[PDB]
Amino acid sequence: PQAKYRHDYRAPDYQITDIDLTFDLDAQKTVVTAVSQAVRHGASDAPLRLNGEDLKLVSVHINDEPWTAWKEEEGALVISNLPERFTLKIINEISPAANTALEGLYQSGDALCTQCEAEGFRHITYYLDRPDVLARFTTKIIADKIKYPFLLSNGNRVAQGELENGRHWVQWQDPFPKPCYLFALVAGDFDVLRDTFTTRSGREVALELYVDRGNLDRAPWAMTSLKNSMKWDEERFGLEYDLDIYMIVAVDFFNMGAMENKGLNIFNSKYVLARTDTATDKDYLDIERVIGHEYFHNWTGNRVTCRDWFQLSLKEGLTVFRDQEFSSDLGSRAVNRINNVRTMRGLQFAEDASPMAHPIRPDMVIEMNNFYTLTVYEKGAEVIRMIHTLLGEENFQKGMQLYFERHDGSAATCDDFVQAMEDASNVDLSHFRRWYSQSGTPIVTVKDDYNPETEQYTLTISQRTPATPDQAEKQPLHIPFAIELYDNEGKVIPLQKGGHPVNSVLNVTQAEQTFVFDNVYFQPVPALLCEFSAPVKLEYKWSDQQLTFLMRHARNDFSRWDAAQSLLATYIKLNVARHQQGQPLSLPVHVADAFRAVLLDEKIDPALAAEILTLPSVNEMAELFDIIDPIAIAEVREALTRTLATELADELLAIYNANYQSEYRVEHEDIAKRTLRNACLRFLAFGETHLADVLVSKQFHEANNMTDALAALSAAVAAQLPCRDALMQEYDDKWHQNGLVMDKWFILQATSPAANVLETVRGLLQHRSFTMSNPNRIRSLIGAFAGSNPAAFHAEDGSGYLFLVEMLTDLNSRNPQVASRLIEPLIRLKRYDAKRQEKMRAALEQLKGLENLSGDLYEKITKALA
Ligand code: NA
Ligand code: NA
Ligand code: NA
Ligand SMILES: [Zn+2]
Numbered sequence: 001p002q003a004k005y006r007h008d009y010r011a012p013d014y015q016i017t018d019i020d021l022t023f024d025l026d027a028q029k030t031v032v033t034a035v036s037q038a039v040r041h042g043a044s045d046a047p048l049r050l051n052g053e054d055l056k057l058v059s060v061h062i063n064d065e066p067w068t069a070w071k072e073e074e075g076a077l078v079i080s081n082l083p084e085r086f087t088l089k090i091i092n093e094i095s096p097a098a099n100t101a102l103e104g105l106y107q108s109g110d111a112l113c114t115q116c117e118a119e120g121f122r123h124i125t126y127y128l129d130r131p132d133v134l135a136r137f138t139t140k141i142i143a144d145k146i147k148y149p150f151l152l153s154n155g156n157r158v159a160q161g162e163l164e165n166g167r168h169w170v171q172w173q174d175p176f177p178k179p180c181y182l183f184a185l186v187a188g189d190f191d192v193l194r195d196t197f198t199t200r201s202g203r204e205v206a207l208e209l210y211v212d213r214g215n216l217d218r219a220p221w222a223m224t225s226l227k228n229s230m231k232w233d234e235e236r237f238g239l240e241y242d243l244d245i246y247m248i249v250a251v252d253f254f255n256m257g258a259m260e261n262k263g264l265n266i267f268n269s270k271y272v273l274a275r276t277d278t279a280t281d282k283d284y285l286d287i288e289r290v291i292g293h294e295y296f297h298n299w300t301g302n303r304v305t306c307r308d309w310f311q312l313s314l315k316e317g318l319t320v321f322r323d324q325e326f327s328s329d330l331g332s333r334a335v336n337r338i339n340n341v342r343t344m345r346g347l348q349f350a351e352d353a354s355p356m357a358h359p360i361r362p363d364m365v366i367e368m369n370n371f372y373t374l375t376v377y378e379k380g381a382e383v384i385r386m387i388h389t390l391l392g393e394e395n396f397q398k399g400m401q402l403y404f405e406r407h408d409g410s411a412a413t414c415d416d417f418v419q420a421m422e423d424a425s426n427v428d429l430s431h432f433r434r435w436y437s438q439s440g441t442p443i444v445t446v447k448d449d450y451n452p453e454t455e456q457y458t459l460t461i462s463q464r465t466p467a468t469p470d471q472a473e474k475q476p477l478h479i480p481f482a483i484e485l486y487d488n489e490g491k492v493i494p495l496q497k498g499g500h501p502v503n504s505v506l507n508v509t510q511a512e513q514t515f516v517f518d519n520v521y522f523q524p525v526p527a528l529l530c531e532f533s534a535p536v537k538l539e540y541k542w543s544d545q546q547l548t549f550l551m552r553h554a555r556n557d558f559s560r561w562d563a564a565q566s567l568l569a570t571y572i573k574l575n576v577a578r579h580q581q582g583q584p585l586s587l588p589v590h591v592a593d594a595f596r597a598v599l600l601d602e603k604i605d606p607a608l609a610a611e612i613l614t615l616p617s618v619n620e621m622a623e624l625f626d627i628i629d630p631i632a633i634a635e636v637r638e639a640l641t642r643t644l645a646t647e648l649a650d651e652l653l654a655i656y657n658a659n660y661q662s663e664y665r666v667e668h669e670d671i672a673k674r675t676l677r678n679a680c681l682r683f684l685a686f687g688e689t690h691l692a693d694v695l696v697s698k699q700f701h702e703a704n705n706m707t708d709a710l711a712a713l714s715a716a717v718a719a720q721l722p723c724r725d726a727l728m729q730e731y732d733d734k735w736h737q738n739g740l741v742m743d744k745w746f747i748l749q750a751t752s753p754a755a756n757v758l759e760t761v762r763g764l765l766q767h768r769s770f771t772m773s774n775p776n777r778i779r780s781l782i783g784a785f786a787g788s789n790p791a792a793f794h795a796e797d798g799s800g801y802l803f804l805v806e807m808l809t810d811l812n813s814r815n816p817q818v819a820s821r822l823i824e825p826l827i828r829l830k831r832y833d834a835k836r837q838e839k840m841r842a843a844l845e846q847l848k849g850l851e852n853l854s855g856d857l858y859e860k861i862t863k864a865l866a
Contacts, residue, residue: 004366012041016036019037020137021035023142053123057091094123100815105124114185115255148189152186188210191211225288237299252269257271258291258294260301276664277705277706300315344379360380363470367858369856403421442534445463460512478509479508483530484554486550497518502517527559571587572624575636595644607675627833642686693723706741742770743780746781751788773814798842812852845865
């Protein structure tokens with residue numbers, strides 16, 4: 001598989017301006033006729049090179065002349081000796097029922113549907129499958145009326161008719177030119193929830209949510225979230241929807257989460273279907289986030305698209321920033337910021353320390369589906385958020401407006417977006433651009449000095465990014481480093497120097513520099529990297545009392561959570577080293593007291609209390625270490641939970657009972673009290689056994705909503721309580737027919753601390769609710785075991801690696817995109833001890849030798865074994 005490089009981008013030799021598609025649809029054999037209007041822009045003698053994969057070519061015509069000057073080569077149809085402008089007609093056949101990779105046109109249950117991003121349209125017809133070719137599409141769909149009563153594509157219906165032999169057809173037209181990755185087709189029988197949204201200028205939009213028959217009970221929250229997304233994008237960004245119909249189709253078999261195809265988004269049903277007995281608070285807020293995300297791509301992705309796939313973050317960093325701003329404005333901004341920071345420090349930092357590290361704008365890709373990553377998405381959004389911190393909201397919105405004025409209707413680059421921000425705001429972002437080209441996590445080290453003779457506080461701040469496997473050279477970044485200084489009363493000290501205010505976002509742009517602040521009338525307790533102002537590791541020699549002072553006094557809720565994380569980090573590291581020497585948990589009394597004070601503080605928002613009372617996950621904990629000991633981390637997390645359960649037993653039960661709610665509401669104040677109640681339940685489950693078993697079994701059986709039922713079931717599995725096997729069997733008997741609900745139960749089986757977890761997991765491959773044909777089931781059972789139970793995945797006998805090699809041996813042929821997500825825990829071998837690295841290298845060598853190894857896995861395995 002050869003690599004492609006960003007620096008090789010060149011404008012295409014030919015453009016296509018308009019394409020009229022006809023599909024004669026059938027699951028075994030679909031016939032595609034594609035009539036494209038093409039224009040040559042390159043040299044007279046340059047052939048037209050069309051991409052195509054797994055197509056049966058039937059005919060090639062140029063201006064209705066059967067063409068003889070062409071050849072097929074691997075991946076391509078190369079057509080020579082063309083006029084400057086011409087009509088290309090291709091007929092070819094494809095077979096949706098054979099498509100187990102779920103890329104192109106495929107079958108989801110009884111429906112046919114598409115996924116074209118990134119390079120899936122070349123699995124449908126021969127085309128210029130590159131996102132700087134934008135064309136106006138017309139799509140005619142012909143199919144059996146009984147099997148496929150709804151025939152959908154982008155845009156508006158312009159024609160429809162009935163044919164003999166029980167077939168019918170519909171034709172769609174989308175007026176906005178688009179790259180082919182935004183094409184979609186759906187055919188099937190659905191229930192349809194229909195609603196309307198009127199834009200602020202009065203455009204009436206028909207909203208249509210297509211779901212499998214019988215699922216209309218689970219559709220209204222998605223529809224509500226779509227309307228909420230459309231209203232928010234008008235209020236915050238001034239953007240209205242631009243078409244007449246907005247369709248969303250929920251399908252069960254889908255690799256990419258959801259997809260922003262223009263006017264016809266296709267979603268995995270996990271991010272659409274919810275009712276209070278099947279979905280948790282987190283499912284409702286994930287549906288809100290992902291509906292919002294795909295809607296926000298209408299502008300940041302569709303009206304302005306990407307010139308090439310190395311520019312993916314241009315739409316994904318910006319659209320993830322927009323989905324986080326939407327969730328944070330509608331809900332709790334501090335809870336959203338806290339959770340996005342846990343994903344950055346616990347999952348994205350791990351990727352930036354791995355063989356797959358890349359800048360948010362990659363320079364080299366073998367398989368572009370491997371680059372839909374935590375780095376391009378979540379680190380990409382942190383980079384957009386640093387532009388917002390440097391510019392402020394008003395200048396950032398001026399930059400958005402300039403970006404659309406310049407680039408509406410075109411494919412643009414990351415650099416174009418940064419240029420628009422710099423030109424609209426007059427803030428220089430020339431050094432800032434290095435965040436697009438440099439991979440790895442910067443480490444920012446801070447030393448401080450307070451001089452009582454001069455009342456000056458000095459911060460000496462240094463930065464470095466360690467080399468990564470992809471880049472030997474690293475340079476300083478422009479790091480926006482927000483601070484606040486607190487006096488002995490907890491009041492913020494004004495930042496000034498030389499009689500002038502100093503902005504609290506310091507511009508850390510050198511390898512080392514000093515900042516001096518005057519009129520600091522009391523030795524300060526600093527809050528550093530406020531709101532996680534840059535995506536960096538902070539090195540500061542905190543005392544325990546500075547951190548518990550910030551937990552009591554810091555003005556932004558995020559800083560009080562973050563200070564609690566820094567305080568825990570020191571004691572997680574202490575106790576992992578103790579575990580390695582066979583010693584039990586040690587924790588100072590004053591650290592348990594700081595968490596007691598959070599439980600008993602009547603003024604703290606329950607939303608913030610709940611997050612301070614949610615320990616860092618085992619993946620967050622792993623990134624505190626150079627070499628990860630996953631068994632020490634898992635057992636220290638358990639011991640820390642048991643120790644706080646014992647020390648805080650009476651306060652945890654009081655707050656558990658105080659936050660009981662008889663009515664269930666998907667409302668943010670209620671979700672905060674419930675998240676705090678279930679944070680208390682998690683500790684109580686690890687307290688005295690009989691009380692724990694009673695509390696947890698009562699909550700499971702009395703719950704009036706899935707958030708509380710699943711919090712009790714998860715606590716029974718995590719604490720291995722007596723009631724666990726009965727509750728787990730009750731849930732299977734009640735819910736085995738509902739795959740989305742069973743995904744929660746497979747994740748609890750896969751992440752169980754029980755000694756026999758791998759045997760249980762292997763047995764669940766034969767479970768009635770499991771199938772290797774469905775990406776959600778694969779991720780919930782196999783992915784959760786490898787990625788979310790590292791203690792079992794890294795069992796010392798190597799059994800977890802062998803199990804993953806067997807599953808990847810199947811998935812490499814069936815669905816290489818799902819296989820490449822699942823291999824990720826094996827590519828992190830250099831973070832583990834030598835004996836685990838040996839076994840993980842042997843597993844990767846076994847997969848490198850597979851017949852018909854996919855490019856998706858080849859790229860990751862070769863980087864891991866280098
Ligand atoms: Na809010
Ligand atoms: Na993909
Ligand atoms: Na100091
Ligand atoms: Zn996106």
